[PDB]
Curated annotation (Swiss-Prot):
It comes from Homo sapiens (Human). The modification N6-acetyllysine is found at K41, K63, K77, K114. There is a cross-link at K74, K77 (Glycyl lysine isopeptide (Lys-Gly) (interchain with G-Cter in SUMO1)). There is a cross-link at K74, K77 (Glycyl lysine isopeptide (Lys-Gly) (interchain with G-Cter in SUMO2)). One of its GO terms (molecular function) is GTPase activator activity. Belongs to the Rho GDI family. The modification N6-succinyllysine is found at K77. GO terms for cellular component: cytoskeleton; cytosol; extracellular exosome; immunological synapse; membrane; nucleus; Schaffer collateral - CA1 synapse. GO terms for biological process: negative regulation of apoptotic process; regulation of protein localization; regulation of Rho protein signal transduction; regulation of synaptic vesicle cycle; Rho protein signal transduction; semaphorin-plexin signaling pathway. Transmembrane segments: none annotated. This is Rho GDP-dissociation inhibitor 1. Controls Rho proteins homeostasis. Regulates the GDP/GTP exchange reaction of the Rho proteins by inhibiting the dissociation of GDP from them, and the subsequent binding of GTP to them. Retains Rho proteins such as CDC42, RAC1 and RHOA in an inactive cytosolic pool, regulating their stability and protecting them from degradation. Actively involved in the recycling and distribution of activated Rho GTPases in the cell, mediates extraction from membranes of both inactive and activated molecules due its exceptionally high affinity for prenylated forms. Keywords: Acetylation, Cytoplasm, Disease variant, GTPase activation, Isopeptide bond, Phosphoprotein, Ubl conjugation.
């Protein structure tokens, strides 16, 4: 009861080219993302931004983990060391390095991503699943 020490609040694809917002509110119903997708134009640059709050005490070794699937088949895994954080009023933001969306006809289509935010105590701060659809155009 009932403000947890760590609350993962959002995922955003930061993409200058995109004509609309690309945000998941992670304080919401996580199951809903499975039938939703972010659309990205092929080859566009973007970062993933994870927003999270620390409310009471230091947390060490925060880590963001992504696994990428295509048609239910695992194709990639990436781990990002986020670091050690103490409490503060404002949400922290972790940004992945710039990446490009896949490009070329064979690579277009939908991909699913399983995301986890954890720490060196292996706490399941949040796990969620979301989809990315790569298209010729926005």
């Amino acid at each position: 009861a009932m403000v947890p020490n760590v609350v993962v609040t959002g995922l955003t694809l930061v993409c200058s080219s995109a004509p609309g917002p690309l945000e998941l509110d992670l304080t919401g119903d996580l199951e809903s993302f499975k039938k939703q997708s972010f659309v990205l134009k092929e080859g566009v640059e973007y970062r993933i931004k994870i927003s999270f709050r620390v409310n009471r005490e230091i947390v060490s070794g925060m880590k963001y983990i992504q696994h990428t699937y295509r048609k239910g088949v695992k194709i990639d895994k990436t781990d990002y060391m986020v670091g050690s954080y103490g409490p503060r009023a404002a949400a922290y933001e972790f940004l992945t390095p710039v990446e490009e969306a896949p490009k070329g006809m064979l690579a277009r289509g939908s991909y699913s991503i399983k995301s986890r935010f954890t720490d060196d105590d292996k706490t399941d701060h949040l796990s969620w699943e979301w989809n990315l659809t790569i298209k010729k155009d926005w």
